[PDB]
């Protein structure tokens, strides 16, 4: 009972700011018409919009509450998403004449829902164009209502802005009804800039002043800040405006370092240094998919040199594979990454620390001085036209680490997706061009997982890469920018930022194909596997298997052309002799994404 009074206060007084985003899901639907029909309900004529251009601050006197209306750039799909993630309420605009495009309008409903929506409302301003008779118009309104309920059953009736009865009910909801909270946005800080100015300090960099009201967890002078399509930046000063305090950047401020100082690799020896006449074999445990992992050796090149970093495994679930081991293939950044022991506990601690050590709480008007470089000012667009939102970053969020994303294919995405090709990933407001190693999610004791070359279509897979830490487990949207597509991007998949564990070891499989030709009572001769007698001698330790379900071992080399004799438990001139080998796959560093 007490909690309801405290939660209302920030928005139910002369110092409130309610973010409302107008999202018309149809090509031939104007957002200004949707706004005019919504602002018509209030008796104050001086509220009405003509020629602020897209982002307006309107004070509705009928419900004694300030409203902040945002109109996105419909040419850019990502801008529509950007305006909605900052919104407290989203006004979806449906058309009576034109149907919602599956490739664009429908995809907006899909993408906004997957990145996180605070509150939604169905609205029709195009009902007049259908018919003159109310019997024909209501049949169209009911048809749109069934479509809107299919995406989310939270809304039962799609309000029509034509009738003053339904339009007054919408404004009453946008002004009085408390909006829902978005986990990642509200646990961070978020300020929608009303006015942006710049102060020169040096001929290279200065201070970018942002005036706005704090929403979410709040802001701290030491904590880093993030401007979308610009990057992460450090703060210098923050001024609090109160109706009848200044917080400065300390010695304990966060650094803009992506990786640890060059030399950190020399201060820790968690390395399994390994030194042989026979190839490596790990037998610690108890004993479509084959085709993509199959490999074929070249006759000129030796298999010892090619498959040097490969290990034979009796069982991948029980093998003693180790993290941080000595390997030349491993990235240089590996030791310079953020190593989090227990993500679950570090995530809760930083969140609790941020809320408790917050300087400018939600509802406070602030003047944010951001240490900004002068060269980036040419890309800054008017805050009244294009949404200028500043999202606060938690402790060590800038720092890169071995991050794990859960990812499921976007509905009706039959196209394949390989596990090394660059894909843009939007986790929260941040977006980076990620090269993700896919692996099927499993509860293995050794945390060793088989590296899948392509995204599995039946279930949800796990993408592993090197990217900065997200301490809010923000939902992730995976896309590839397409120029041929209506919306400048081609949405690949959706998911969530799982954790930041390096303990997840990924192993690439290599299956050697071999064909038997000669058959003695016990001695079976295979030929298409190796092409050197030395190569046969080296891989002798790794047991052989057959696609028919037989098991065996290499006896010795026959000729100088890699022919070999082998003994099996059960095969003919039609069976395929095979050998499975495994190598460690290291995560790949990712670059940021703007525009």
Author numbering: 67 to 117, 120 to 312, 335 to 365, 369 to 380, 479 to 761, 763 to 787
Paper passage:
However, Tsr1 lacks all the conserved motifs required for guanine nucleotide binding and GTP hydrolysis, and is therefore a structural mimic of translational GTPases rather than a functional enzyme. Since Tsr1 is not catalytically active these data suggest that, rather than acting as a molecular switch, Tsr1 is a molecular gatekeeper that must be removed before key sites can be accessed to catalyse the final stages of pre-40S maturation.
We reasoned that this segment might hinder crystallization, so we generated a ‘loop-out' mutant (Tsr1Δloop), in which residues 410–476 of Tsr1 were replaced with a short glycine- and serine-rich sequence. We found that Tsr1ΔNΔloop complements loss of wild-type Tsr1 in yeast, showing that the N terminus and acidic loop are dispensable for Tsr1 function in vivo. The N-terminal domain (domain I) has a small GTPase-like fold.
